[PDB]
Design a protein around this nucleic acid. Structure first.
Ligand SMILES: [Mg+2]
Ligand SMILES: [Mg+2]
Ligand SMILES: [Mg+2]
Ligand SMILES: [Mg+2]
Ligand SMILES: [Mg+2]
Ligand SMILES: [Mg+2]
Ligand SMILES: [Mg+2]
Ligand SMILES: [Mg+2]
Ligand SMILES: [Mg+2]
Ligand SMILES: [Mg+2]
Ligand SMILES: [Mg+2]
Ligand SMILES: [Mg+2]
Ligand SMILES: [Mg+2]
Ligand SMILES: [Mg+2]
Ligand SMILES: [Mg+2]
Ligand SMILES: [Mg+2]
Ligand SMILES: [Mg+2]
Ligand SMILES: [Mg+2]
Ligand SMILES: [Mg+2]
Ligand SMILES: [Mg+2]
Ligand SMILES: [Mg+2]
Ligand SMILES: [Mg+2]
Ligand SMILES: [Mg+2]
Ligand SMILES: [Mg+2]
Ligand SMILES: [Mg+2]
Ligand SMILES: [Mg+2]
Ligand SMILES: [Mg+2]
Ligand SMILES: [Mg+2]
Ligand SMILES: [Mg+2]
Ligand SMILES: [Mg+2]
Ligand SMILES: [Mg+2]
Ligand SMILES: [Mg+2]
Ligand SMILES: [Mg+2]
Ligand SMILES: [Mg+2]
Ligand SMILES: [Mg+2]
Ligand SMILES: [Mg+2]
Ligand SMILES: [Mg+2]
Ligand SMILES: [Mg+2]
Ligand SMILES: [Mg+2]
Ligand SMILES: [Mg+2]
Ligand SMILES: [Mg+2]
Ligand SMILES: [Mg+2]
Ligand SMILES: [Mg+2]
Ligand SMILES: [Mg+2]
Ligand SMILES: [Mg+2]
Ligand SMILES: [Mg+2]
Ligand SMILES: [Mg+2]
Ligand SMILES: [Mg+2]
Ligand SMILES: [Mg+2]
Ligand SMILES: [Mg+2]
Ligand SMILES: [Mg+2]
Ligand SMILES: [Mg+2]
Ligand SMILES: [Mg+2]
Ligand SMILES: [Mg+2]
Ligand SMILES: [Mg+2]
Ligand SMILES: [Mg+2]
Ligand SMILES: [Mg+2]
Ligand SMILES: [Mg+2]
Ligand SMILES: [Mg+2]
Ligand SMILES: [Mg+2]
Ligand SMILES: [Mg+2]
Ligand SMILES: [Mg+2]
Ligand SMILES: [Mg+2]
Ligand SMILES: [Mg+2]
Ligand SMILES: [Mg+2]
Ligand SMILES: [Mg+2]
Ligand SMILES: [Mg+2]
Ligand SMILES: [Mg+2]
Ligand SMILES: [Mg+2]
Ligand SMILES: [Mg+2]
Ligand SMILES: [Mg+2]
Ligand SMILES: [Mg+2]
Ligand SMILES: [Mg+2]
Ligand SMILES: [Mg+2]
Ligand SMILES: [Mg+2]
Ligand SMILES: [Mg+2]
Ligand SMILES: [Mg+2]
Ligand SMILES: [Mg+2]
Ligand SMILES: [Mg+2]
Ligand SMILES: [Mg+2]
Ligand SMILES: [Mg+2]
Ligand SMILES: [Mg+2]
Ligand SMILES: [Mg+2]
Ligand SMILES: [Mg+2]
Ligand SMILES: [Mg+2]
Ligand SMILES: [Mg+2]
Ligand SMILES: [Mg+2]
Ligand SMILES: [Mg+2]
Ligand SMILES: [Mg+2]
Ligand SMILES: [Mg+2]
Ligand SMILES: [Mg+2]
Ligand SMILES: [Mg+2]
Ligand SMILES: [Mg+2]
Ligand SMILES: [Mg+2]
Ligand SMILES: [Mg+2]
Ligand SMILES: [Mg+2]
Ligand SMILES: [Mg+2]
Ligand SMILES: [Mg+2]
Ligand SMILES: [Mg+2]
Ligand SMILES: [Mg+2]
Ligand SMILES: [Mg+2]
Ligand SMILES: [Mg+2]
Ligand SMILES: [Mg+2]
Ligand SMILES: [Mg+2]
Ligand SMILES: [Mg+2]
Ligand SMILES: [Mg+2]
Ligand SMILES: [Mg+2]
Ligand SMILES: [Mg+2]
Ligand SMILES: [Mg+2]
Ligand SMILES: [Mg+2]
Ligand SMILES: [Mg+2]
Ligand SMILES: [Mg+2]
Ligand SMILES: [Mg+2]
Ligand SMILES: [Mg+2]
Ligand SMILES: [Mg+2]
Ligand SMILES: [Mg+2]
Ligand SMILES: [Mg+2]
Ligand SMILES: [Mg+2]
Ligand SMILES: [Mg+2]
Ligand SMILES: [Mg+2]
Ligand SMILES: [Mg+2]
Ligand SMILES: [Mg+2]
Ligand SMILES: [Mg+2]
Ligand SMILES: [Mg+2]
Ligand SMILES: [Mg+2]
Ligand SMILES: [Mg+2]
Ligand SMILES: [Mg+2]
Ligand SMILES: [Mg+2]
Ligand SMILES: [Mg+2]
Ligand SMILES: [Mg+2]
Ligand SMILES: [Mg+2]
Ligand SMILES: [Mg+2]
Ligand SMILES: [Mg+2]
Ligand SMILES: [Mg+2]
Ligand SMILES: [Mg+2]
Ligand SMILES: [Mg+2]
Ligand SMILES: [Mg+2]
Ligand SMILES: [Mg+2]
Ligand SMILES: [Mg+2]
Ligand SMILES: [Mg+2]
Ligand SMILES: [Mg+2]
Ligand SMILES: [Mg+2]
Ligand SMILES: [Mg+2]
Ligand SMILES: [Mg+2]
Ligand SMILES: [Mg+2]
Ligand SMILES: [Mg+2]
Ligand SMILES: [Mg+2]
Length: 275
RNA sequence: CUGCUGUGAAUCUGCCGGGACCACCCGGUAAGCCUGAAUACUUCCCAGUGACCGAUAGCGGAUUAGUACCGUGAGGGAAU
RNA sequence: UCUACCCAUGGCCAGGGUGAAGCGCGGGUAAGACCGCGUGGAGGCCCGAACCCACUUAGGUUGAAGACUGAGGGGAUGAG
RNA sequence: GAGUGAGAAUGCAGGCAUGAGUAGCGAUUAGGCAAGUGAGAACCUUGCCCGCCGAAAGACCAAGGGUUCCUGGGCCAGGCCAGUCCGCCCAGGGUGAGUCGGGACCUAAGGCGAGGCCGACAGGCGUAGUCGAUGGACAACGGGUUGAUAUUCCCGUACCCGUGUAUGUGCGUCCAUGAUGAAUCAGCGGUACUAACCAUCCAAAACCACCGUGACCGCACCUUUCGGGGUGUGGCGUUGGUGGGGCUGCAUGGGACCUUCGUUGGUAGUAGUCAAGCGAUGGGGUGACGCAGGAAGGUAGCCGUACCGGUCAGUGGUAAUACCGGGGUAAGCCUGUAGGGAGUCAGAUAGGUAAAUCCGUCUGGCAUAUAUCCUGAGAGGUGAUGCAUAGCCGAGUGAGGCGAAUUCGGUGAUCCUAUGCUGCCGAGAAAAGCCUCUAGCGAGGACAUACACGGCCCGUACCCCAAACCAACACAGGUGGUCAGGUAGAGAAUACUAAGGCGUACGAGUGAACUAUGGUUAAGGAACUCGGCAAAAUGCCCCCGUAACUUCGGGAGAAGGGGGACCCACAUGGCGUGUAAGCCUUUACGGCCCAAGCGUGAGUGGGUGGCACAAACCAGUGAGAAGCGACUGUUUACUAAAAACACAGGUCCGUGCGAAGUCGCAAGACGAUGUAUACGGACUGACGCCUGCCCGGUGCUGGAAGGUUAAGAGGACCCG
RNA sequence: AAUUCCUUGUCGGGUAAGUUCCGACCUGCACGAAUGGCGUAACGACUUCUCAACUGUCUCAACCAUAGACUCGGCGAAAUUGCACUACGAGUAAAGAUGCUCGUUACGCGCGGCAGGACGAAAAGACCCCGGGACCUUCACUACAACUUGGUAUUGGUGC
RNA sequence: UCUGAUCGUAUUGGGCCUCUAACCUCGGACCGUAUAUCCGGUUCAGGGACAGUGCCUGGUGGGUAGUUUAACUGGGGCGG
């Protein structure tokens, strides 16, 4: 949940931290972890393609299974629920009966010791993973694939879920987290439930340092820079830029979705803004 | 005459040239290939010549010279 | 090889204070809220060396120095 | 025929004046004397004093340098003066490793990159690879020696890899020993072709009743004069629909013949299969990890002391009572304590890119013990009849020789247990290595002792917070790591000092002005000045006492005020420590208590002295109000540190996933090993209260009715 | 008012006396709501004003010590430089004279001091102008990358 | 044959619907391969004559680039 600090110092004052209430264990599986390093927002040319990234507290990658297909009718019990740097949600550590350990994105209402079965025959209880064709229309699902066997892609993040609106032919129509309605192939798997840590968003970081640890460097505002740097720059005084707002690279505001994309044939409407 | 993109022919009353283009004359025979000599040049060696220099000149360099020395480096660069 | 940011891997940070959550004991109640006292040892917390800066001032100003020196000054478990 | 004429280009090269025998001669330590050498001495050698550093200006290294090191010479250049001296010049010498730092071991970021993809060409990325320590793994310590090296040589004692022989154990295949095992035929039940059996579903062909009537027939009524035409009914035909009854097929479920599979009689525990040791390039464990924080248990060091050796320091007092100097010794091998860590046997199972007795998971049983096992500080033993040492001898640069005691306490680490434990959230490298598991090799091979051997390449001198490196200089600057004595003190601050090291390269004088850097000051006390700039002041410990306002934490060390030296008494006390004794035992590296001994405050009472008792050094100025920025941060290296930038928070716009966005001609990359509670962009900037009106202008978003509009189609007309 | 030209606006407070400061007034030259508006505890080597304490900052200076300066010994530079046995006054002149005129004053040579002049030294004025650059802006001109429109090639079949 | 209305057989463009065989897939699974998230191949599942890429063409285009931006003037600007 949210544990709020007492203002014992000006930094800590508004701030809050996640009460980690769902954490059974502090120490990830030595098998399922890969090493990882920060790129600091620089590509293979070493240039900065993505500004504002860097700093950061060194972190190791847990290998999540988004791919779950293999195990069928093999029931797993949830061993621990532990904490993952790389993503917003938690991760459940499953033990199959096969004696194979896997991580999954921890669903909502998943408690330690539960049973979870993936396959066709499975129940519509939380945590279970089944192809969209076997799911009663109108449920709430998450970690959804795109193509049949393309891994889980939609609705991974904390507190978030997809409503499955219906079924026609080989297309099942989903309402995305964004509020946008998109069609998809009924062969592709989904997981049943919402996603844990729905309080994630009310964490109030409270001091610059904290955001630094988490990896974000500071951001300089356009209007401040010289006109050589940024299009908004310049002026003697404070300015509003005196120009219609743009990126630092001069491209204006507006729709950036490139038209003609293939998937565009699937999409029923895009999200609506400020309605 | 020639590049790329399209369209796309005829085999000798054929086809291409004769400064848009058309006729008549003349010339030639595309879309296959080789080919010496006459012409250009001197890192390098031999033999010379000079109304060229003669040591602040002549090569940056007659003396340890691309050395000493300067510069992270590309590079610069003496004096006797 | 200076400097700006990043990445990997190491090291450093005398000494002193303050006393967060949590936990415990007693109170308080129907059970709470809540109130003492204990542990406990949080923090871009406080005082202050190493260290990192460079605020004021005096001197230097063909300098000891192509940017220093002396007095004081700021940060000093952290965006170090 | 001219490279033909110079006074001037802040002209170029060289030589030389003027300033001028002038400024300087490089800190914040400081030198003096006697003798010595020598042509010559403020500066060189020795001696005796004095002074300075002492978390350094001492000791040892990395980087960098490259002979600067040692001996013997030198003394025109160099050294800011001289010079016999030198870090300068000349000659010779000097660097010794199985273990220390690296390679032959391992990988991180990153580099390169066979094929490869992309790119007119040049090339851009990148897979397998292979490199790349600042990290991981891996075996040594004390003492002595030379003019110069030493964890390298030597002495003593270890450890780690390999190789050969010899000996003894115990195993092996051959022989055989255990364990098991499945295969076929033969006696049987439910899977299950196939004809049915049972139950139900449905309706072609449809039997019947009713209504609706393509059209036809027309009886009756209305209608225009009559027609057209509308209505009521029936005869039927069925573009038709509805309710009841049966046959046929169909599907499904249930038992059953075929078939098979499972079960058990014969064999065939016979022909099979495995088992000594090696064992992966394969599987699994481990390796393997943040930051903070103590508490605890230890030692190193230091301070005492039993004991040992010694001195009389021409002064008033002091012969042992006083004083000075000793009061040492490693790795390793034993031993396994404080601390910390751990459930274990049997069955099944294929999940672990084949197989696994291993690992995982599921079952079970058996365990709450100080049981067991691993780990591990230090105590103790050995190492050590040795080595070292305070001194004492004579010889004298020096050589060498002898060599006493070598107990018990206190204090105490930032070091060790500890890569531990406990919290916390920001969730904290890899690979080799070592341990195992089989695949696989295998007739031979393991284990111990003894003996004999092999142990490679590079660094190794000297400087290293500096006159030896970077700074053009023998330059007040810069440069990472390791050691850390004493008395005061909270302390690695400061003061004084040990060990050790220096006095550092111009001097000698002299009361000038003036300048700098320190010092003191009657009376007044900001009158100074742009401005209390600069000084002065405050300053420590322990008590007392503290306001407005407040986001309830702060403000606050607010302000303001008191005590502090020495001596005695309380006190043969209080607290810490802990020995003898005592008590207790599961008798051990035990526990409990502890007279003595050593250490140390705090306080109360009484004295004593001074101008002053935080006596030096060290060490907050405080209070009221306003603007700006919430805050810690950051910034114009070399005139600007702020009110600027950042910030946590806010709102908007974009982005549905090799996304948007950026880097690239592309491939590809980052975004992100993320997925709308996420990511990019823009403005605002903690918190509180709030955020009004305008869509004409110009942007963005959406929309096509028109109006305008390219190439492509179209070739009427016209011309040759 | 970090915004108010007129302006030291007007009043109150503080001072013996206040162009600054604090509090109001509103006649806002030319405030105003995320280029945010109005507040705000804590914080500031920020700016501004007042007070206590304390003082050589001052009335008004004095004395002392070191390091320079000064003397002697040794070494031994620099920037600068058309010349030279290089006065002053009133004038004159490219309009500010050591150097010209008329006068007045002054023995030769040093040494220590001070800074009025030498339009002193330094740096081919940074201000201003003119010419030339550069870099920045944009509904200046013209282009190009990027982004996009339709045609055509790669590109085919059956249907309406 | 003409003022004109039509069918069916041709030609030829326009829209629309589908299909699969070009083409596309950072979808799967095997193989090259002992080791490869590279790359290539086979196959499966999808898209599908669209998209992408050429050539032609119209836009948008301070994102970048080259440049221009007068003179007189009782200094220059403003004015004229
Ligand atoms: Mg590169
Ligand atoms: Mg960003
Ligand atoms: Mg998380
Ligand atoms: Mg947030
Ligand atoms: Mg905050
Ligand atoms: Mg910003
Ligand atoms: Mg700016
Ligand atoms: Mg720039
Ligand atoms: Mg711009
Ligand atoms: Mg600006
Ligand atoms: Mg402005
Ligand atoms: Mg704005
Ligand atoms: Mg602007
Ligand atoms: Mg949004
Ligand atoms: Mg040819
Ligand atoms: Mg020459
Ligand atoms: Mg000559
Ligand atoms: Mg060089
Ligand atoms: Mg406490
Ligand atoms: Mg408490
Ligand atoms: Mg702090
Ligand atoms: Mg502070
Ligand atoms: Mg200073
Ligand atoms: Mg001076
Ligand atoms: Mg200082
Ligand atoms: Mg300080
Ligand atoms: Mg201070
Ligand atoms: Mg401090
Ligand atoms: Mg000439
Ligand atoms: Mg001449
Ligand atoms: Mg000349
Ligand atoms: Mg000259
Ligand atoms: Mg001279
Ligand atoms: Mg002079
Ligand atoms: Mg003189
Ligand atoms: Mg002098
Ligand atoms: Mg000196
Ligand atoms: Mg000096
Ligand atoms: Mg003498
Ligand atoms: Mg000391
Ligand atoms: Mg070194
Ligand atoms: Mg000598
Ligand atoms: Mg000499
Ligand atoms: Mg000399
Ligand atoms: Mg020497
Ligand atoms: Mg030599
Ligand atoms: Mg490469
Ligand atoms: Mg190649
Ligand atoms: Mg290597
Ligand atoms: Mg290393
Ligand atoms: Mg030595
Ligand atoms: Mg040694
Ligand atoms: Mg790990
Ligand atoms: Mg831990
Ligand atoms: Mg201790
Ligand atoms: Mg006597
Ligand atoms: Mg003694
Ligand atoms: Mg097991
Ligand atoms: Mg021992
Ligand atoms: Mg620790
Ligand atoms: Mg050997
Ligand atoms: Mg060397
Ligand atoms: Mg050595
Ligand atoms: Mg050495
Ligand atoms: Mg030293
Ligand atoms: Mg220099
Ligand atoms: Mg040097
Ligand atoms: Mg020196
Ligand atoms: Mg130096
Ligand atoms: Mg340092
Ligand atoms: Mg000390
Ligand atoms: Mg000190
Ligand atoms: Mg001293
Ligand atoms: Mg000494
Ligand atoms: Mg004098
Ligand atoms: Mg004097
Ligand atoms: Mg003075
Ligand atoms: Mg006075
Ligand atoms: Mg007085
Ligand atoms: Mg006053
Ligand atoms: Mg005044
Ligand atoms: Mg005055
Ligand atoms: Mg004033
Ligand atoms: Mg001051
Ligand atoms: Mg003072
Ligand atoms: Mg208090
Ligand atoms: Mg006080
Ligand atoms: Mg206060
Ligand atoms: Mg005892
Ligand atoms: Mg007894
Ligand atoms: Mg007992
Ligand atoms: Mg008295
Ligand atoms: Mg203080
Ligand atoms: Mg106000
Ligand atoms: Mg600030
Ligand atoms: Mg604010
Ligand atoms: Mg800075
Ligand atoms: Mg500056
Ligand atoms: Mg500051
Ligand atoms: Mg400054
Ligand atoms: Mg800034
Ligand atoms: Mg806010
Ligand atoms: Mg923000
Ligand atoms: Mg934000
Ligand atoms: Mg993109
Ligand atoms: Mg906006
Ligand atoms: Mg702002
Ligand atoms: Mg509008
Ligand atoms: Mg509009
Ligand atoms: Mg409009
Ligand atoms: Mg509106
Ligand atoms: Mg539009
Ligand atoms: Mg046309
Ligand atoms: Mg004001
Ligand atoms: Mg006024
Ligand atoms: Mg007034
Ligand atoms: Mg006043
Ligand atoms: Mg006011
Ligand atoms: Mg205004
Ligand atoms: Mg508004
Ligand atoms: Mg606005
Ligand atoms: Mg603001
Ligand atoms: Mg305000
Ligand atoms: Mg305020
Ligand atoms: Mg600050
Ligand atoms: Mg400040
Ligand atoms: Mg003097
Ligand atoms: Mg002299
Ligand atoms: Mg000169
Ligand atoms: Mg005149
Ligand atoms: Mg005159
Ligand atoms: Mg005259
Ligand atoms: Mg004359
Ligand atoms: Mg004179
Ligand atoms: Mg003068
Ligand atoms: Mg002067
Ligand atoms: Mg002057
Ligand atoms: Mg000029
Ligand atoms: Mg100009
Ligand atoms: Mg196409
Ligand atoms: Mg196209
Ligand atoms: Mg543009
Ligand atoms: Mg431009
Ligand atoms: Mg041009
Ligand atoms: Mg003009
Ligand atoms: Mg004018
Ligand atoms: Mg004029």
């Amino acid at each position: 949940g949210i544990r709020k600090y007492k203002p014992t110092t000006p930094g800590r004052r508004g701030a809050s931290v996640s009460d980690f209430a769902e954490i059974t264990r502090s120490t990830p599986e030595k098998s399922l972890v890969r090493p990882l390093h920060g790129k600091g927002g620089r590509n293979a040319h070493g240039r900065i393609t993505t500004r504002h990234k860097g700093g950061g507290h060194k972190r190791a990658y847990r290998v999540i299974d988004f791919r779950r297909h293999d195990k069928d009718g093999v029931n797993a019990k949830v061993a621990h629920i532990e904490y993952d740097p790389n993503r917003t949600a938690n991760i459940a550590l499953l033990h199959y009966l096969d004696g194979e350990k896997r991580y999954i994105i921890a669903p909502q209402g998943l408690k330690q010791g539960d049973v979870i079965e993936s396959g066709a025959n499975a129940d519509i209880k939380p945590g279970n993973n089944l192809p969209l064709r076997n799911i009663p229309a109108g449920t709430v699902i998450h970690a959804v694939e795109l193509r049949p066997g393309g891994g889980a892609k939609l609705a991974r993040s904390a507190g978030v879920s997809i409503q499955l609106l219906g079924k026609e032919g080989t297309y099942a129509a989903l309402r995305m987290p964004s509020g946008e309605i998109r069609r998809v192939d009924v062969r592709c798997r989904a997981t049943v439930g919402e996603v844990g840590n729905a309080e994630q968003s009310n964490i109030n970081w409270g001091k610059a340092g904290r955001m630094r640890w988490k990896g974000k460097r500071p951001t300089v505002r356009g209007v401040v820079m010289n006109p050589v740097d940024h299009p908004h720059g310049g002026g003697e005084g404070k300015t509003s830029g005196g120009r219609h707002p743009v990126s630092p690279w001069g491209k204006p505001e507006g729709r950036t979705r490139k038209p003609n994309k293939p998937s565009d044939k699937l999409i029923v409407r895009r999200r609506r803004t400020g309605k």
